[PDB]
Amino acid sequence: MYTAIVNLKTYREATGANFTRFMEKFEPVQGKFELIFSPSLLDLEKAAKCGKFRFFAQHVDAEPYGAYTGHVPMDMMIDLGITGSILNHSERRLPRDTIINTLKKASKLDFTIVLCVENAEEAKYFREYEPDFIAYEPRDLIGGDVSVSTAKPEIIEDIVKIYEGTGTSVLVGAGIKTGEDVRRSIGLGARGILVASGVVKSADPTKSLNSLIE
Amino acid sequence: MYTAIVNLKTYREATGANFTRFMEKFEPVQGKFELIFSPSLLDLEKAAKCGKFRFFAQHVDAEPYGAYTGHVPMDMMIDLGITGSILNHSERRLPRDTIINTLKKASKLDFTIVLCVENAEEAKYFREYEPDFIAYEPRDLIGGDVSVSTAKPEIIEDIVKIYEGTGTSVLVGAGIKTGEDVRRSIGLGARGILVASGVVKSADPTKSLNSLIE
Ligand SMILES: O=P(O)(O)OC[C@H](O)CO
Ligand SMILES: O=P(O)(O)OC[C@H](O)CO
Ligand SMILES: [Cl-]
Ligand SMILES: [Cl-]
Secondary structure, three states: OEEEEEEOOEOHHHOOOHHHHHHHOOOOOOOOEEEEEEOOHHHHHHHHHHOOOEEOEOOOEOOOOEOOOOOOEHHHHHHHOOOEEEEOOOOOOOOHHHHHHHHHHHHHHOOEEEEEEOOHHHHHHOHHHOOOEEEEOOHHHOOOOOOHHHHOHHHHHHHHHHHOOOOOEEEEEOOOOOHHHHHHHHHOOOOEEEEOHHHHOOOOHHHHHHHHOO | OEEEEEEOOEOHHHOOOHHHHHHHOOOOOOOOEEEEEEOOHHHHHHHHHHOOOEEOEOOOEOOOOEOOOOOOEHHHHHHHOOOEEEEOOHHHOOOHHHHHHHHHHHHHHOOEEEEEEOOHHHHHHOHHHOOOEEEEOOHHHOOOOOOHHHHOHHHHHHHHHHHOOOOOEEEEEOOOOOHHHHHHHHHOOOOEEEEOHHHHOOOOHHHHHHHHOO
């Protein structure tokens, strides 16, 4: 019933040659949390070939197969077995029309979009386009040791309210380190979490993740 | 002494599961042309693993390993064994400050950049940043049946002149189909070519490519 997304970003520990050995340490989970990992674009085909976990891309382009140098098309991901993507992350922000065009395309194709937003106004703006997930991550907290649930509890509540009774699930991220941060987020109405450094940069990633989702 | 770049873009025939099958049909070449292929970003780590040809990325980001969701870092490429990239293709245009920052970074790391431009004034703009290659491709001819050497011979000459006596080699592309197009491009001063549809969409890609570089 809840979702946990582990965003590997482009961290040295979980990308390139390290991707396989980093993942090797995790085991599937049964619990309240559906587990999703987000590998770097260069690692995504490798990830998809295994399929030991559910994998989402970090970013996706709406352009079809064809003359699109330097793109990562949604149709190509689908063919590789990738069933979703993060979009508009604070580190990979996009114009609004691009986002809308991509959501429109994904809605036809049973491809899941996790749309990141930086505030409640952006969250509202995108509501009518019916993203599958909204991921609230305040830009300045990302990578830090202060939880979004600690720092922005009222904004979390506002975004949840915005999406109440829609098919969109609200996730929250930035600075999530402990089980307590996760409980607090669920307590404020969120349906799950995104995490990167708290897991990827840990002395024991597998154990850190288990702390969050237990 | 010359360079030929085969840009696979995101063409169905040469991406995904088709990448390996597509490449399997080519053999190294001995001749005046150094042969480089440019696979799609999702196929790049696969391509790098093999290394039967020299492979360049279709695009590259300057950001280091770290918190850069949805990026394709130069350092990650270098660790996978990729030694260069196309940059600022007409299909993947970038702001000038991003380009400059990327060149500056590549110039420190012995990573080769093939900088695309759309006209002579843009070619001049970039001259002081010393790109390893300049690739003149007029935007409106890309994918068409009219060669850059047929349609823009004076602009080719102008760009070559701009870079004369620098360490930068000038390549040309757009609508290159025949050995004649190639001879004509070299004849106007170019040091090589970029080609996509003429090879990728051919009945016999291997023979089409051999026609160009013989
Ligand atoms: O603050 P972090 O390191 O958990 O990173 C959060 C990510 O931006 C989630 O996508
Ligand atoms: O006209 P094409 O299909 O050879 O395309 C040329 C490419 O833009 C070279 O990168
Ligand atoms: Cl790192
Ligand atoms: Cl195609």
